Design a protein around this ligand. Structure first.
Ligand SMILES: Nc1ncnc2c1ncn2[C@@H]1O[C@H](COP(=O)(O)OP(=O)(O)O)[C@@H](O)[C@H]1O
Ligand SMILES: [Mg+2]
Lengths: 40, 470, 41, 577, 127, 385, 312
């Protein structure tokens, strides 16, 4: 009953990997938006 | 990035800067010295000649030739979001939990606007705090301001943490039967020590209550202006949540005495004449502005409930702080040093405690139909037993009648089982069952304050309840 | 009881008088520092 | 129009330069424009006390002085409305801004869009003086009379015909160019002029037997009540508002806590006027302030309410004014005084607290209006000191100028005795002046019956030690008779149910009949005791039930019941022998 | 038993923070690589004119040694003094007429001032 | 700077029965000792300096008499360190600033002492810091503000006095040093309010920060009843966290005995209200027994002779034995009372003298003395009945 | 003033008990007066003339009709003379200050003339430091045979122990001898009240080789018994006197005898042995079981002697 946390740890790792892999595909658009907004 | 370098005077917490008329009154500024350290401050007074800034921290290392002052924000504002739940802040919105800073959906001025009196509605429903002495005899109603009057060595922090991690709503008792309305807890700490900070962090982490709580923690060595700003930020977050996402919010203020002392220090630093007992003359207005932000609003499903906590300086109820707090709020919960010394926890004293909105939060469609009669009968019986216990010392036990002995035994069992619940989480039904079991010790005809129907329906149970949860 | 009440009211009057004297002295020092900073020109 | 710029900002105090010529107590717009008040003038510099928060202001922003002191708008449209401390309608503020009161909002006290049925009562070429009646406007069953401002004289040049108009329409134009509208403004700190103030020789019927008999208040008098928790003050005030002589009721909150004010705001609209089928709010004006509202509004709410009451009585009606808590107003006054660094007098209060209380309370009275008609203001202001101590300076100052004091007690309410006015502590000073009116309109012996009842109650209260030490059964026949007569009095004359259909209101005739019945029964019982009859036999007579049910008898059917009970009282003793 | 949800939430928050930090790093690199672009002289022209017009009157104008060739023309046009200072980078500093007030228009300061505001917009757009 | 702050788990043994038992202070906590002049603050602080279990002791003589410093300097070298056995002065750092020394140096002395304590903590030791009086520091701040012509807050003190006191007191605690070791600082500061008024702002400011409070009483000092600690006016917030250590190192049922003693004292204090009204003789037998037990506890357990060669130091086990004896005697006495034995007969039982003299028994003879006293207590009631 | 003169007249060390050698050095008295009246000054002069102490006394007289600002410098000059004598010529100095209340009045006048921030009741905030600069000038220095002893005298306004002057003086000095008005009204002289009095350096000069070995325990037992008698006095004032237990009567009688004999001694000179004998005779009024603060050896050696046997 002491090993319950391992499955939640691996699920959290999978969720973090999914989030980072989803976000990596759209970095350039956000960077371009920030550059467009900052520059006068 | 505007920069002002015409500083001509530094003394204590105040510094004067020249040719800075663009600074709005009450704005937030930061002072940068020669070594590059950046420390903040607030504009106190601005005129055509110079502006006056009160420094948050100490003024060691400042000089009139190398320091500079820049503007940060025109008006003190905080960025709020629905994802603040589960985070800790230092009292000025800076995270201290090591997690990334939140993304603010919108920024709001912490000095919130007063509620329109014609927009409020009558509080109607209760909050199950899990403590029998509070749930039964001093019921807390959604939208009430019910402070806790504590002492010097009394365990106010333990009670605050227990209420925070035990409080919940009971929609099934009202007939809805669904947990449609979310529940959230906002915790504000002012002038706490390191030990109290560690205790609060451990208590919130160990039970999972952090997932529904927002903590604003202000240490004792932090700048006093942060202590001033902490309750306003906490109440701003609470109001935003309740009145924009239909949340039920319970706000706990750890120590209003520290807030009053900080307010006195700030007032004295600005060279103002104090009022009664050396306290600022506008203390009543400030406390009212803090307290009156809680309530329920017509057309909104959310609510805000406040439980201020203050330590009476010399156990005096005539001190300005508790006097004004009771003059603004709608009751109080009194902690007794005698009960604490007798090993009873939580040491809540029913006799001087009072709730002015209890009659609205109980009835037949909510809690149970016998709540008020049981509560008042318990109050009267406990008062009678306590009074008899004083006379039994001098006149002896044998000189008492049978009713006096029954009352004495009832009072002793009440103190042993009802108040001294330890760390248990008693629901309202369990507390009512314990109360009825205690009342069953008295004779059938001695319950003058209860209708015969409730007596017939509930009388006769024996004491087998507290033993079910050691 | 009446003796205790009389003692209580006497003590209260003494404390109030001391508070009023302190307030007056504070106002006096504020007025005089204002006078000095005004006449220094 | 005096205009200046901000020179210096420090807290709620704003210093403005270039304000030469500004009058001493004008109202100013500070900022882009927050409402302020000039409190000091020095050269080209004026000191302004801003009512609201000053955060965000900057040096150099405009300052405009309106050129007039604090004033209220008097005219049609005030009834059935709710206002803050400085006469801002809360309903339209909620409509405009939502659930919060945003700073810098501006609204008009009287609605400028509503149309009223004008009805002139003056003709061209007629001389008009201050206080004369110009026309008539219906308002919720009242005849609202348009009055000339008190400081206006002239003769009428033209008058508009009857029709629909707004309050801004110049209905009457004088020959000097003056235009008279349906409303006018009056400073709240100046009492409205009167022709003459009359003596207090008429009673203010409250509808409660204890207040109407034992501790009366004259029409135009002043009364004060405590406000302890659990004593049922709110229901007493509501019953007073429902069953009073006043045609118009003005209610002032002046800084009460939020939930109590919410209860008051949600209870009055559900009350029903006894004289008709409509709600009581059609002849009620509400002034509400929470403890977190600006202090200036809380301080000026009392004056605003009393000025509105003065206007309504100047129209020729009877007005009852209820100040909910003068202690909160005193606290606000203390805070404002401390803002000016004034020397405190006693327990932090300013030295002029008594003067301000007297100035507020002395606006009450029955006067001959400038129009020659009679009007009055009755003030019932409650004091709720922290801790209930009567040595607190506000209570001492109040008790030196009021004419009556109705001490509400929580102990009586604990034993389910209502309306729970303690008769031992209460007193009144209007009995001697009202005695001729009682003789004329009630009965020639009414003062004697009242004194007899008071003496019986005093004797009953004098025996409380023995009945507590040894119990009632250890007394003699006379002592037991006194105790039982006092109990009958308490349970049948002083007690009154406000929620009962017929027992809610009691006229003077019914109270006189009940007192006479009680006194006659006491005389018969004492005679029977003198004739050797046992006390237990007396305490079991059936006419006691008829006496007990007297207060539940209808007003029109009362005389027959009273005659039958009077006959039965003499029959029960003499016939049994 | 429910702590796994809290750990999942913390992991998601850490991932979001890492993504925001990566966006910050990319924007920082793009800004610091600006002086190698043909738009760089126009950007410093805009910064110089904005700094000179923010102050009603500037006693002197401070520019980076590499920036002064692209702004000397309007430095002479506006009639303000030009002074060189190696420490300044990606911007210009204008000193007030009285010498007590100075304004800084470096791109780093602008990024610091605007990122806290555009964080919500970029978070909404990215996810 | 330090790496991390730790939770206090071990107690700070001061060698005094009342402080070690009723109002314990943990290693890394803070305590305050307010009282009027002549109550015994300086003697108590010297007793802690002599008998505490800290590795290094730093004593700050802020604005007090010089004769105290002379006494410390003369007497400490001739004493022995309880830990290592060497001279006691070898573990003491003394900072002296007498009354007639310049006023502005008191703040400097306080800061120097606390900084030296922090450094010795950084070295990995356990340091106990004792300030002679922070009231003199407050008075020095008031004098400096008066020279500065500031606006006083209350009683002439500058506004920032509370902030400075909080900053000074927050330096204490048990930490993990930057070098990876573990150390702690324990701060005990005495307060001397003018006229003995406990509402003085310095005392109120201190009361809201320290975790333990040891209030002194003038009436007990007048009776020459030392340490003269007001039981009713004192408290401690470290009791709950130190329970496992007490269970492990002293006895399994030590908290129960302490709770029983506290409950008995509370009941005696409650009965004193009736005693002062109707006299002691108007009570029943049980109430008289409770009063007598309270008197025995006050005179034989709480009391301690600081100038006695044996009573000056008292270990935890000795106090545990004494309180166990007192509780056993109370139980037997109430059992006998239930059997109709007169209260006057019980008060003359010879075991009371043994209980009273048990305080003077040396640390070596106590283990057998406790057994003999327990056997005598059992015999005086069970065998007699 | 009478107590001060008696102390100055009768003071002497006891080298025989300490075994320090019969040096027998007379005391040198430095007398400083501040705002003293003619009556008190004449009394002091007459006493010193009678005792022949003017041949070895230095007087600094500031009469009540002298300017009030001169009181600032008088104690400093007196203490400078005392320090010079003691630490440069091995003298033994007994310094008497007539009234510190007048000095505090002058200090408050100067502070109010300069508009200092006051302490309590208008006194300047630096009064503690100013008084410390005067009191802390006495003591003994290592390597020198001299000594400076200070006996300040001050009158508490309205007998208030919480007044700033006596409060600060107690916070600075090493104890105090407090006089009781009730004892004075009962004819007891000297009216020294033992319970509020205190001597901080008491235990440094009493013990085995100094005075007698039973000194400290007898003192503690006397204090305890007197406190018990005082409490029983309140008990008697509250309830009937006939309800007292015999132990209460014994304590009450002990308190009365203590007040009448130990305190009220008149103008006579008592050696330490006589005082200890009287104390033991008074303690003999209680049973041996009640002497819990005295070791059994001293009780066996000394208990039992009769009070009436001392004089008769
Ligand atoms: N624990 C104690 N045991 C014995 N005597 C004590 C004790 N505490 C104080 N005293 C006595 O009481 C006196 C009180 O003086 P002191 O401790 O210096 O007081 P304070 O610190 O308040 O100035 C001591 O000089 C000593 O004679
Ligand atoms: Mg000391």
């Amino acid at each position: 009953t002491e090993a319950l946390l391992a499955r939640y740890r691996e699920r959290a790792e999978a969720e973090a990997k999914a989030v980072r892999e989803k976000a990596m595909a759209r970095l350039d658009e956000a960077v371009a938006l920030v550059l467009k907004e900052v520059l006068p | 990035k505007k920069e002002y370098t015409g500083i001509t005077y530094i003394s204590g917490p105040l510094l004067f800067v020249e040719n800075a008329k663009d600074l709005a009154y009450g704005a937030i500024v930061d002072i940068k010295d020669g070594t590059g350290r950046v420390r903040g401050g607030q504009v106190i007074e601005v005129s055509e000649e110079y502006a006056v800034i009160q420094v948050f921290e100490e003024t060691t290392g400042l000089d009139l030739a190398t320091t500079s002052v820049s503007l940060v924000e025109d008006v003190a504002r905080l960025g709020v979001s629905k994802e603040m739940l589960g985070r800790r802040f230092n009292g000025i919105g800076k995270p201290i939990d090591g997690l990334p800073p939140i993304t603010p959906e919108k920024r709001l001025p912490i000095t919130g606007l007063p509620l329109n009196p014609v927009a409020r509605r009558k509080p109607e429903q209760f909050i199950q705090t899990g403590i029998s002495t509070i749930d039964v005899m001093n019921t807390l109603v959604r939208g009430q301001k019910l402070p806790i009057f504590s002492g010097s060595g009394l365990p106010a922090n333990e009670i605050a943490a227990q209420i925070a991690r035990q409080a919940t709503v009971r929609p099934d008792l009202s007939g809805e039967g669904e947990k449609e309305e979310p529940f959230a807890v906002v915790f504000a700490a002012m002038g706490i020590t390191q030990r109290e900070l560690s205790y609060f962090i451990q208590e919130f982490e160990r039970t999972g209550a952090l997932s529904r709580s927002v903590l604003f923690l202000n240490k004792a060595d932090d700048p006093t202006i942060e202590r001033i700003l902490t309750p306003r930020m906490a109440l701003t977050v609470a109001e935003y949540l309740a009145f924009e996402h239909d949340y039920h919010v319970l706000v706990i203020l750890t120590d209003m005495t520290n807030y009053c002392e900080a307010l006195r220090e700030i007032g004295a630093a600005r060279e103002e004449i104090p009022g009664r007992r050396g306290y600022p003359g506008y203390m009543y207005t400030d406390l009212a502005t803090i307290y009156e932000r809680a309530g329920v609003v017509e057309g909104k499903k959310g609510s805000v409930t406040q439980i201020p906590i203050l330590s009476m300086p010399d156990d005096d109820r005539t001190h300005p702080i508790p006097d004004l707090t009771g003059y603004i709020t709608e009751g109080q919960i009194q902690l007794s040093r005698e009960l604490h010394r007798k090993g009873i926890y939580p040491p809540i004293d029913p006799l001087p405690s009072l709730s002015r909105l209890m009659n609205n939060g109980v009835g037949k469609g909510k809690t149970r139909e016998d709540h008020k009669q049981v509560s008042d009968q318990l109050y009267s019986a406990y008062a009678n037993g306590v009074d008899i216990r004083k006379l039994v010392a001098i006149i002896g036990e044998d000189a008492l009648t049978e009713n006096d002995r029954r009352y004495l035994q009832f009072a002793d069992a009440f103190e042993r089982f009802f108040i001294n619940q330890g760390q248990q989480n008693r629901s309202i039904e369990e507390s009512l069952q314990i109360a009825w079991a205690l009342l069953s010790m008295l004779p059938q005809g001695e319950l003058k304050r209860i209708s015969k129907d409730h007596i017939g329906k509930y009388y006769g149970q024996k004491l087998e309840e507290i033993w079910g949860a050691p | 009881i009446p003796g205790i009440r009389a003692q209580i009211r006497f003590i209260q009057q003494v404390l109030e008088q001391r508070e009023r004297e302190d307030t007056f002295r504070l106002k006096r020092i504020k007025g005089k520092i204002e006078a000095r900073e005004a006449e220094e020109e | 129009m005096i205009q200046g710029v901000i020179q210096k900002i420090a807290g709620p105090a704003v210093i403005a330069k270039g304000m030469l010529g500004a009058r001493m107590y004008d109202i100013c717009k500070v900022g882009e424009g927050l409402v302020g008040e000039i409190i000091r003038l020095d050269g080209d510099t004026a000191f302004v006390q801003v009512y609201e928060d000053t955060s965000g202001l900057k040096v150099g922003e405009p300052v405009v002085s309106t050129g007039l002191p604090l004033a209220v708008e008097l005219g049609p449209g005030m009834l059935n409305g709710i206002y803050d401390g400085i006469q801002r309608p809360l309903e339209r503020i909620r409509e405009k801004t939502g659930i919060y009161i945003t700073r810098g909002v501006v609204v008009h006290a009287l609605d400028r869009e509503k149309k009223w049925a004008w009805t002139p009562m003056v003709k061209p070429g007629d001389e008009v003086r201050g206080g004369m009646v110009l026309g008539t406007v219906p308002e919720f069953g009242f005849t609202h009379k348009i009055l000339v401002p008190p400081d206006v004289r002239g003769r009428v040049k033209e008058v508009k015909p009857a029709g629909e108009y707004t309050v801004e329409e110049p209905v009457v134009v004088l020959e000097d160019g003056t235009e008279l509208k349906m409303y006018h403004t009056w400073p709240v700190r100046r009492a409205r002029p009167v022709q003459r103030k009359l003596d207090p020789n008429t009673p203010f019927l409250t509808g409660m037997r204890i207040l109407d008999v034992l501790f009366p208040v004259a029409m135009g008098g002043t009364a004060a009540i405590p406000g302890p928790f659990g004593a049922g003050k709110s229901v007493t005030q509501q019953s007073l508002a429902k069953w009073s002589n006043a045609d118009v009721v003005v209610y002032v909150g002046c800084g009460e806590r939020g939930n109590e004010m919410t209860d008051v705001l949600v209870e009055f609209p559900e009350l029903t006027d006894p004289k008709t089928g409509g709600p009581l709010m059609h002849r009620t004006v509400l002034i509400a302030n929470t403890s977190n509202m600006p202090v200036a509004a809380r301080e000026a709410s009392i004056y605003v309410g009393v000025t509105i009451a003065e206007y309504f009585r100047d129209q020729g009606f009877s007005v009852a004014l209820m100040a909910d808590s003068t202690s909160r107003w005193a606290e606000a006054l203390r805070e404002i005084s401390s803002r000016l660094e004034e020397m405190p007098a006693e327990e932090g209060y300013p030295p002029y607290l008594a003067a301000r209380l007297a100035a507020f309370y002395e606006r009450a009275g029955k006067v001959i209006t400038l129009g020659g008609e009679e009007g009055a203001v009755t003030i019932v202001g409650a004091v709720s000191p922290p801790g209930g101590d009567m040595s607190e300076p506000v209570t001492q100052s109040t008790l030196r100028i009021v004419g009556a004091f109705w001490r509400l007690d929580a102990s009586l309410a604990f034993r389910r005795h209502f309306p729970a006015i303690n008769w031992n502590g209460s007193y009144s000073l209007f009995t001697s002046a009202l005695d001729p009116w009682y003789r004329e309109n009630v009965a020639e012996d009414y003062p004697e019956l009242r004194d007899a009842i008071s003496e019986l109650l005093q004797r009953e209260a004098g025996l409380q030690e023995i009945v507590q030490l040894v119990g009632p059964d250890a007394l003699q026949d006379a002592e037991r008779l006194v105790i039982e007569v006092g109990r009958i009095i308490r349970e049948d004359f002083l007690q009154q149910n406000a929620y009962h259909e017929v027992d809610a209101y009691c006229s003077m005739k019914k109270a006189y009949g009940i007192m006479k019945m009680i006194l006659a029964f006491y005389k018969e019982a004492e005679a029977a005791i003198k004739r050797g009859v046992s006390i237990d036999e007396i305490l079991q007579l059936p006419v006691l039930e008829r006496i007990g049910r007297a207060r539940y008898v209808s007003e029109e059917e009362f005389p027959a019941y009273f005659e039958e009970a009077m006959k039965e009282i003499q029959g029960a003793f003499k016939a049994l022998a | 038993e429910s702590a796994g949800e809290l750990l999942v939430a913390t992991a998601r928050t850490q991932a979001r923070g890492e993504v925001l930090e990566e966006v910050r790093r990319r924007v920082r690199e793009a800004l610091e690589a600006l002086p190698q672009k043909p738009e760089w002289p126009e950007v410093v022209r805009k910064l110089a004119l904005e700094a000179l017009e923010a102050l009603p009157g500037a006693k002197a104008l401070v520019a980076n040694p590499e920036d002064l060739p692209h702004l000397e023309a309007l430095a002479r046009e506006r009639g303000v003094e030009l002074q060189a200072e190696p420490a300044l980078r990606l911007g210009v500093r204008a000193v007030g007429a009285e010498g007590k007030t100075q304004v800084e228009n470096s791109l780093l300061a602008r990024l610091d001032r605007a990122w806290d505001a555009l964080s919500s917009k970029v978070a909404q757009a990215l996810w």
